[PDB]
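Render vanadium chloroperoxidase in 3D.
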Amino acid sequence: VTPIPLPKIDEPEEYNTNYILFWNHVGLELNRVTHTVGGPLTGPPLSARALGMLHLAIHDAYFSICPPTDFTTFLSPDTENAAYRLPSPNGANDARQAVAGAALKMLSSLYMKPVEQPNPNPGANISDNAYAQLGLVLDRSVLEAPGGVDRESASFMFGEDVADVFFALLNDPRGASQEGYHPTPGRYKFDDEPTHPVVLIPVDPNNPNGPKMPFRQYHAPFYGKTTKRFATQSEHFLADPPGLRSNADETAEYDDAVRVAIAMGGAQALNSTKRSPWQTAQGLYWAYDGSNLIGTPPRFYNQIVRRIAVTYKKEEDLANSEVNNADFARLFALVDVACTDAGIFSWKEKWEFEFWRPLSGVRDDGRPDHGDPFWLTLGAPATNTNDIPFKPPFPAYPSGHATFGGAVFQMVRRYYNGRVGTWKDDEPDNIAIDMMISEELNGVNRDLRQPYDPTAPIEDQPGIVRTRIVRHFDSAWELMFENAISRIFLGVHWRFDAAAARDILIPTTTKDVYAVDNNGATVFQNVEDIRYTTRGTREDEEGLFPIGGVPLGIEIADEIFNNGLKPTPPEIQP
């Protein structure tokens, strides 16, 4: 097996001298490699789950050895319910080895070939090479771990024990199954993306150049409603999107959303595209749409959180600081569990509503003066491949990116309020970062002129290089906001998929019609003024509910944090 040459990561080398950060990094490496080889745990929600599981395991292993004062372990060693009973250290006291055991066992269970029956049907789609490439990462990580790995230690064994409990309890082997799901075409209905209506996949993954077969991908249509939640203490719901159910009468809102969609998310060269070059940058920056050597959004969110963590650490020493180890172990557990649950609920709502994506909404509108049957979006970038931009194979409402961002960044905000600055729980923070680079725009990754070559470094492959853009952000509120609107710029999401138009756009004297500049480009509210307060109704439930992914994510993070990271009550699991 020729090891895939992975491009350099843009972050200080010192980060990986901290073992909590190192294992997080390993999880991120597996994330990008699995999306390059087509291995297990691909896609946004499940990749998030993998990281949540990794950090939950690391969290309990560490805090069992170094007991916390302000909170407790996710699982208790005294729980009668075996499924939720955390193993006891019984003498083990090496947190470094405990974390290593937990991290290695969890990642191995997650990414190694499920030979034990699961290979059939479930795993029957991943090649041996895919597993081999992932194994390479796992194996060398043992050798790269700061301080080394001692498999013989009681602490390492304890860590493995911890991981076993979490894997058994939270792993969702067939969670992303689409078997039985089929779109139900109609106005506002999700269906196969018109520029990629079907794909030809090899009949045998182990024989990539052998016979192919048509494939219509629907990403995890049952996951959200069936999977076990992590730390949420209730079910989360969004208001009906414009045009559907109780909000079917919001025609002005919908029509304006169509207008905004065309102007802000169309292909670069279209005469109707009013988006600016900078806005194109904002759109691509947050992509991470499962591309080769890049992975999914959860990977980028963690890259950013790693920087935030180091930037705002209590002690200078990254290698031998228990204060830092505890800080990071807790932060990442909170963040990745929040990200996991954000993925669950955004996917649950996505498939519940089955709201169509902008490309289809614009093309299939049907009204001569409103739609554009030949519209093209900037699209989700097919980076490090010669493939054309596409549309994620799942419904639009709400945006996965928006929800992930709301959860991740609200969690960061709740965690750092009082340390980095002071603000109202729901108001702009001051958690700034600089020198933040997205692998979508790093001067290395590219749009290839020929199919990706996994045996050669990306820089040796002909293609158009993505401009290197080094960013600075003033707060997590800004990160959250830009992450959400990035999908509008790409043309893959409606404004309401992100948040209530009223909460992010500049209003006019005309209801539901928002301000545009002299060129027709949508004007946004200043980040400092944005408040996600506009709620809407649901046909099936009483009351007002949040609109879009951002508010949803915010609520998920707050609920988890408020409860101090505790398991979702078994009684309320699906």
